[PDB]
Design a protein around this ligand. Sequence first.
Ligand SMILES: CN1CC[C@@H](C(=O)Nc2cncc3ccccc23)c2cc(Cl)ccc21
Ligand SMILES: CN1CC[C@@H](C(=O)Nc2cncc3ccccc23)c2cc(Cl)ccc21
Lengths: 304, 304
Amino acid sequence: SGFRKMAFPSGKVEGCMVQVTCGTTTLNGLWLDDVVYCPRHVICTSEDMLNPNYEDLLIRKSNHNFLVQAGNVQLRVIGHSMQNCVLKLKVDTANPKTPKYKFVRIQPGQTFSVLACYNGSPSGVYQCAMRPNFTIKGSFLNGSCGSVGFNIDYDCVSFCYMHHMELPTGVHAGTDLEGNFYGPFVDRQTAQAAGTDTTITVNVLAWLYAAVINGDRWFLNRFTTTLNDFNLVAMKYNYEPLTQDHVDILGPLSAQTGIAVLDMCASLKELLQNGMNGRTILGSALLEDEFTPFDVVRQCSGVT
Amino acid sequence: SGFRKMAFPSGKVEGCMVQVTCGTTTLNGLWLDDVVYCPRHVICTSEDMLNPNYEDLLIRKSNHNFLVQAGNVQLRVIGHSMQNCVLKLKVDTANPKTPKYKFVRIQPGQTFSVLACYNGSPSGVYQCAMRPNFTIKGSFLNGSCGSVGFNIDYDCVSFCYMHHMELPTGVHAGTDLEGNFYGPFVDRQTAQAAGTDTTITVNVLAWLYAAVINGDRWFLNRFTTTLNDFNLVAMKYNYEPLTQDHVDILGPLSAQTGIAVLDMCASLKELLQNGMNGRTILGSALLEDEFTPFDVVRQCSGVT
Ligand SMILES: CN1CC[C@@H](C(=O)Nc2cncc3ccccc23)c2cc(Cl)ccc21
Ligand SMILES: CN1CC[C@@H](C(=O)Nc2cncc3ccccc23)c2cc(Cl)ccc21
């Protein structure tokens, strides 16, 4: 019993974190095999971030300008290349702690753990989600760039995010491990506003199923709805539309609780229309949307 | 920017987790040096939990009845002893991954990270606090016993909690690493109700300071209060009394923001009396109390 914002154990990812320095800029890198992945803005000064031409700025850098430090020992850089917004630094030593890994590009609504790092050293681990406007609501300070987001399936770490920047509104933007940003963001100090941060409906439904499994049942009502009727109310509340794919994804939770997906939708509709009335669900006064249906099943079953 | 429920990196603690089996019971153990620490109820059957005499039940167990498995390799048990509600199993091999460590007993209001484990394998990491009624609101399932709670100061892991049981209300109870339970709980399947779960006032004030540092300032008002006036309102809302020690602990946050501690108290008093009015603070519709003043400073400064 109990439902917590739980992150994956970070050990496998801590063993990959290195410090990358280029001139006066120091950020974090991810060392997998003989390659160190880091944001390409490590080659910039603060003045370059205004209008950086990364191809031109990179010409003025050689292998020896990139200082990679793993623990307190220096790694020899024997090659460097730019792939989209990340630099790949070929080092002469393969990471002895390289776990089994994949590079995946996640969809909005999908959650992942972040190991926030400073100077190649981990400071914390927390769970977050790719927002539908392709930002992440993380907890990052200066020097956090290069910190990664990941998921684990038994012994395979799927890296999905690398942190690049904080937008003027305090929200965060970054890339997958191929250097492609999530959303329309660019690695420049320029006016970039985020779109609407809608609520991930399928995740709220999953957390409502987690609440029923953990004994919070006050919000269960006598009603049902249809996907179209539900989506009319969801649109009005800046909630993502719910599809038959989402209903299918919620099937196992529907089976665990005996509560049909559309009945849970009607319950959610009444919570949107009536409010919580000062009550809480799983120790929260608002509807949580950063737990996917897979996260609820994993947490309630004990996947290790 | 951004404020998250952040847990310490779990790597150092994952390297200590082992599986302990006694007869038909399997739980987790913490392997530090040549000692494995685990809940003493590993020697019980489900029927023994009703009225267990641990000294008598332990007589019927020898070193070879305790099966310690680290990874997929068996550890040889060369000694066993009971210390309060934990068993200490002396093994013939010292944990090669033993980090620098301390065993500390924390006070209510203090927070710690939990690495939830099943069969000696980690499943997740989350942050929680020792409630003022000495329970913890964790996320634990059957077999989670022996999972530990800890804090890290650079390279030293201070172990403070070991999970033992879930109370009938879904809340959790456990011991420090000397086997002494937090609160009045006992390791028996018996009616044990928790006391009042009051809000940790000094932690709410710390999180209100975190909100001001991260740009959420709507709740800042034109008032001030005194410790006595504030505590009259705090008592009425089931909030812990605020002491001059708490005011002192909040000093660095008071300095960072330029907002006197008693001004923040007046702001908190108005939030208690008026409510949030549908607004949020750091993405929360309720006042968060599981971030200590030290956690806010650490997260906002980037301690690694
Ligand atoms: C102007 N600037 C600053 C350095 C770096 C940046 O955003 N770093 C940071 C990341 N996350 C939180 C922060 C919190 C305070 C300070 C920096 C933070 C960056 C990166 C890009 Cl791609 C563009 C601009 C830019
Ligand atoms: C009756 N019983 C069950 C096994 C064990 C116990 O509480 N285990 C569990 C711990 N945390 C969550 C759980 C969730 C579902 C099931 C067990 C859970 C235990 C331990 C003590 Cl000290 C006393 C009684 C008792």
